[model samples]
Target: VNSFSGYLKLTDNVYIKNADIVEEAKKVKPTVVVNAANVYLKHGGGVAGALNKATNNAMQVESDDYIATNGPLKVGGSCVLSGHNLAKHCLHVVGPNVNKGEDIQLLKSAYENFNQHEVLLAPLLSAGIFGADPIHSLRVCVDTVRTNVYLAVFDKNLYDKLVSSFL
Candidate 1:
């Protein structure tokens, strides 16, 4: 039962935070989970891969509709899919790579897919592969999403500390 919890206010209404990403998503049961992605719509590694698997390959199926002929999604471009395993909806955005100028475009694309009625769960765009930092990623995400956004953080220390202590 080891758990770590913390939250950072991104603005008047938004926050980026730490928690079990899946667990919190479950708790919120958001209509959509917006995560970063690559151009080809393939889930190679990182949280996006896990989400892809969770959807029972449905994400790939949907993304194929958008990416089937475009070659690969462009930076800041995105596609939506049914939340086959994680949420009711999945928004996959092609994030930037290493200080690319399109970073903000990527962030804007994430929020662009959302509607106010649907509960939204957006992760840090491009942080995993784009070499994006928390401050910048959070800033872009917070500013881009017109409504509130929840950024999930998975802490490895909880396992290294509490769970391992018992072992």
Candidate 2:
């Protein structure tokens, strides 16, 4: 259903990597790791938590400072910060909550917010507590992201779903 390299080739520019975001982000220099963040941009839980832990909370300090200065990021809003120990940079994007009538467009906006970085290490944005369907999240990544991206998935079930769904 996928490539032997543990990546599902969606297009020439996009693929899904069966890897952890923290580990994989480290392998790529000059890359930005996407943090599936909240509007407050707090590194509280989920992928945000792992990212914070990886950076020994250094990223969190910056993130908190960002929000403190700029206020809560609106839905689909984003900001870039020091990756510290993880990647060259961390792009924090707030995805919409489906339960609150937030939709895929907002999630697409999140993906579209990526900058001029040649490569990005991303997660399935909005697919967690935000209530986006994981497959729809993958589609958003495929359709919207312009740079070379590796959508990191550590969960075996999600990896299987992404492979089969895209195939």
Candidate 3:
């Protein structure tokens, strides 16, 4: 998609790689690893838990008002982590619930909601937790983060199948 667009052609910089998200966060040391968050703003769930723990509850507090003011962050909405005491910044985004209503492309919706930047690490959202298939969610991750694509999966084997067959 970056190859050509409405006004001008753009360079494709999407790089697909698989690794532990936390490790990848330290490895790339990106400006910020965009967290796949929910409207609840409760770091008690999903990637939020890991991120909250990693950031030492910094996200917990920041996400509070962000979510309250922007409560029920629809399909494509996001909130910055304000200022966390982290070496690597974290940008949190609320992805669409695949099972909500009859939507299957929450990934795309999530992408639009995120605060756009060059480098971002995304998890295969709504896949395992929300009962979405790995392959299909993988497609969503691939398609959505296609601009500056980076993948960090719990299982490295997910990487294998993606390159092996999902292409």
Candidate 4:
């Protein structure tokens, strides 16, 4: 659970952190914890699965209910849900898939799709299995977010690189 924190050069409110997001979410206690979600909101694997487990699977249950009412979330879209044990609220953002021919604009939109919160804890959107480049995702996050953003990263090399790049 090692975490590093620093301000984004472009904005005083934005922060970058090198840590596992689920653990950092518990520690930082942000108002909104963002999920790198599939369009189905399944919380099936990766960080989504971890968060689901941490919340006692309430994330999946609640998201299922949300989908029943609203249908599948669109790429570049988001919805707010009960955080259960994670935070005051949870934001489920459907990041775009590069393999499916989605553009960076959709990825950028995922960062921008929120309803606004005082403090937001999020991960690198679509940078894993979704196939977006980590640096591009980081850049989009750094560019688009307007709140007190806390960007959490798990990889040590990426963390070091981002910190060095920013510094």
Better of 1 and 3 by lDDT: 1
TM-score of 2: 0.88
lDDT tens readout by residue for model 2, 77-148: 888888787767888888887867876688877878874567777888887677888888888878888888
For every candidate in turn, the CA RMSD to the true structure comes to: 7.1, 3.3, 6.3, 3.2
- Ten-residue stretch with the least lDDT total in model 1: 158-167
TM-scores, one per candidate: 0.71, 0.88, 0.76, 0.88
**Candidate 3 lDDT:** 0.61
Residue 88 in candidate 1, Cα distance off native in Å = 1.3
Point out the higher-scoring one by lDDT: 3 or 4: 4
> In order, how many clashes per candidate?
0, 0, 0, 0
Query: Which candidate model has the greater TM-score, 2 or 3?
Result: 2
Which digits, one per residue and each the tens of the lDDT, describe model 1 over residues 61-102? Answer: 777776776677777777666766677776777767665555
| Candidate achieving higher TM-score, 1 or 4 | 4
lDDT of 2 at 107: 81
Q: lDDT per residue, candidate 4, 24-98, as tens digits?
A: 778766678889898899887878998999998888889888889989988998888887787888888889878
